[PDB]
Amino acid sequence: SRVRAVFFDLDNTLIDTAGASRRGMLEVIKLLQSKYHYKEEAEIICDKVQVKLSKECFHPYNTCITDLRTSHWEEAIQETKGGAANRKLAEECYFLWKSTRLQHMTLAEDVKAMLTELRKEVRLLLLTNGDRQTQREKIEACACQSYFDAVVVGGEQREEKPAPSIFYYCCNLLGVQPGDCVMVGDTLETDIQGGLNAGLKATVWINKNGIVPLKSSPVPHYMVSSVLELPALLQSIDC
Numbered sequence: 603s604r605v606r607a608v609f610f611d612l613d614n615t616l617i618d619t620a621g622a623s624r625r626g627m628l629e630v631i632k633l634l635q636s637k638y639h640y641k642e643e644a645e646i647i648c649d650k651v652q653v654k655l656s657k658e659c660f661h662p663y664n665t666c667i668t669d670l671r672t673s674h675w676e677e678a679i680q681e682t683k684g685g686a687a688n689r690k691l692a693e694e695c696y697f698l699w700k701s702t703r704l705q706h707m708t709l710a711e712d713v714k715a716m717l718t719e720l721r722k723e724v725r726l727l728l729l730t731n732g733d734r735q736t737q738r739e740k741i742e743a744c745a746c747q748s749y750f751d752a753v754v755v756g757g758e759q760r761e762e763k764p765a766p767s768i769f770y771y772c773c774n775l776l777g778v779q780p781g782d783c784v785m786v787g788d789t790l791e792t793d794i795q796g797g798l799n800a801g802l803k804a805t806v807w808i809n810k811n812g813i814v815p816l817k818s819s820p821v822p823h824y825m826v827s828s829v830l831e832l833p834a835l836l837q838s839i840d841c
């Protein structure tokens with residue numbers, strides 16, 4: 603009845619993806635406004651891209667995603683500004699956005715110290731959705747793979763969260779039973795729903811911003827604001 607494995611989301615759970623991604627946007631705005639003499643049109647372009655990205659995370663992706671997310675910019679520039687297509691400016695914007703966010707994707711020192719002290723009591727797995735190319739780059743950017751007994755990327759797999767199969771696979775990977783695992787993540791629709799679907803021992807929601815969820819949304823077993831609260835939490839579930 604003791605916890606034998608803990609699964610961890612990556613984005614906005616272990617690394618500040620959102621903060622990093624907006625930092626990239628800020629640089630793109632800084633670029634367009636200063637260099638290419640833009641005003642408030644730049645901020646509109648970034649919003650269009652941001653919503654374009656959301657309507658593309660559909661699974662199972664195809665590659666090259668680079669060509670896709672780059673096209674997301676040229677489609678965005680033309681809508682706000684206008685004129686002929688500018689693949690060069692789109693290429694610049696994307697890689698500036700990409701290079702910026704990846705450098706800000708790092709594991710905090712106290713987060714590293716938490717993961718290190720935790721894997722000597724339970725096994726650790728990294729369970730993240732997204733395409734192979736994009737996610738693996740993040741993994742390398744924050745060098746987290748060294749901290750986990752296993753890493754599983756949804757794009758590389760048959761199904762992602764919240765589908766229970768990918769959870770069952772993680773369990774087989776570590777030779778454990780779903781009832782011995784706890785899922786930790788910050789998205790209800792994937793991390794939490796998935797944990798409930800796959801009958802895991804517990805689900806832990808990361809809610810630092812203090813969202814009050816709808817009654818119809820998945821209900822976690824636990825709710826905390828930081829991943830630093832797990833050791834005490836996991837010790838209370840008895841491990």
Ligand code: VO4
Binds near residue numbers: 611612615730792
């Ligand atoms: O690391 V994720 O929040 O895209 O499952």
Ligand SMILES: [Mg+2]
Binds near residue numbers: 611612614787788789
């Ligand atoms: Mg997340």
